[PDB]
Ligand binder design. Structure first.
Ligand SMILES: O=C1NCCc2[nH]c(-c3ccncc3)cc21
Ligand SMILES: [Zn+2]
Lengths: 90, 318
């Protein structure tokens, strides 16, 4: 049924839709290509939303709220347990 | 150019101005960027410091999770530790002692065979260490393993992608979701990912890091990097089947719940001939390939472990 060459991976317990790879050619090990060549030669986790341009998303109020919230306390906790040892200038 | 980046880093985390003379950007990546800086230590000497600026879209648990790995496991056995960390809202910067390091591509075809044993030796120390805490690194590759050839010093870095074993001694790792479920998991490099990861296996153990170490060793033995050049997971798998055999891969994947179909059967390769043809280098002992074979065990249950690897005959007498 599937044009060749192909690879199919199925979860044996149905926990997944199968997924597929179809290529022109299967990989082939090229011993002739020169060293060191291979012989085979977004999303904000905070706001749980995709974006296109980071710069703008960072200024958006959804993000600016989170950025300014109390959420970073778990970071803060780990941090206030380390020992500062650099010189700080005024 | 980078002048703007640097300037903006000071704009982002005001407190850095007090402490660091930021000299240069040394790396960029999907999830962070790394700068070189100089600071003064209360104890007297001036220190070179790497500043890793995380991407402000990072979840707080992910940030804290990375940081906790560095605090608990880091600072010992060729694992990177942490001096201090600075935040200003969503901008976090981790400070680390700085290790001047080589490009892998560079030293690749110039290391003596002895330096290869030493390199592998030192990478398994690091993985023994993180594995004791139940840390699954998930992005072991040469660029995350800093090597200074002159000083013979080593350092595993980057826990920005880590997960825990179900019994992790690292509390925050338990809040990181696995790719199997779809905080969010972070994608790693296809060419260093083990077949159980490529096939989306819900059970993912520290064995996945051992396979990655195998791939590194394959590159060292064969003189080729990147060994597996693939941009998606299945391409990577198809390349693996070309090396380790499609039958062998199909069988092994049955043991972890995955049914793999492949339309072109390809036999397993002898690892010695493969590496020799792709290339102390006159008398590479059998033990080397034997170890590579155990690292690139298609079965994650039988794959050799970091502490087992350190006892391999390949490593007498060190
Ligand atoms: O955490 C990191 N992720 C990607 C690359 C990287 N390089 C360093 C690094 C470099 C030199 N000295 C300390 C840390 C750290 C990191
Ligand atoms: Zn956001």
């Amino acid at each position: 049924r599937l044009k060749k060459p192909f690879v199919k991976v199925e979860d044996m317990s149905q926990l997944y839709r199968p997924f597929y790879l179809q290529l022109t050619n299967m990989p082939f090990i090229n011993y002739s290509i020169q060293k060191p060549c291979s012989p085979f030669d977004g999303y904000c986790e905070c706001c749980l939303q995709k974006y296109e341009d980071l710069e703008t998303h960072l200024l958006s109020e959804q993000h600016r709220n989170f950025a300014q919230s109390n959420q970073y306390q778990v970071v803060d906790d780990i941090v206030s347990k380390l020992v500062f040892d650099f010189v700080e200038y005024e | 150019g980078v002048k703007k980046d640097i300037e903006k880093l000071y704009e982002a985390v005001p407190q850095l101005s007090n402490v660091f003379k930021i000299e240069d950007k040394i790396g960029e990546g999907t999830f962070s960027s790394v700068y070189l800086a100089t600071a003064q230590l209360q104890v007297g000497p001036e220190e070179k410091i790497a500043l890793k600026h995380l991407i402000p879209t990072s979840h707080p648990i992910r940030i804290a999770a990375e940081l906790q790995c560095l605090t608990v496991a880091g600072g010992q056995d060729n694992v990177m530790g942490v001096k201090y960390c600075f935040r200003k809202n969503d901008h976090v910067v981790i400070a680390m002692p700085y290790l001047e390091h080589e490009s892998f591509l560079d030293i690749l075809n110039s290391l003596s065979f002895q330096e290869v044993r030493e390199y592998m030796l030192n990478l398994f120390k690091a993985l023994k260490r993180i594995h004791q805490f139940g840390i699954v690194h998930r992005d072991v590759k040469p660029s995350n393993f800093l090597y200074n050839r002159r000083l013979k010093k080593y350092a595993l870095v980057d826990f920005g992608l880590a997960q825990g074993t179900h019994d992790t001694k690292i509390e925050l790792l338990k809040f990181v979701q696995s790719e199997a479920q779809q905080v969010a998991p972070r994608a790693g490099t296809p060419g260093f990912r083990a077949p159980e990861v490529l096939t989306k296996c819900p059970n993912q153990t520290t064995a996945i890091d051992m396979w990655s170490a195998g791939v590194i060793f394959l590159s060292l033995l064969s003189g080729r990097y990147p060994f597996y050049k693939a941009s998606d997971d299945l391409t990577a798998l198809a390349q693996i089947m070309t090396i380790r055999g499609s039958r062998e891969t199909i069988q092994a994947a049955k043991t972890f719940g995955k049914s793999i179909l492949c339309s072109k059967e390809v036999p397993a390769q002898d690892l010695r001939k493969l590496c020799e043809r792709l290339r102390g280098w006159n008398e590479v002992p059998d033990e080397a390939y034997d170890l590579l074979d155990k690292l690139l065990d298609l079965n994650p249950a039988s794959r050799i472990t970091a502490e087992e690897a350190l006892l391999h005959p390949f490593f007498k007498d060190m």
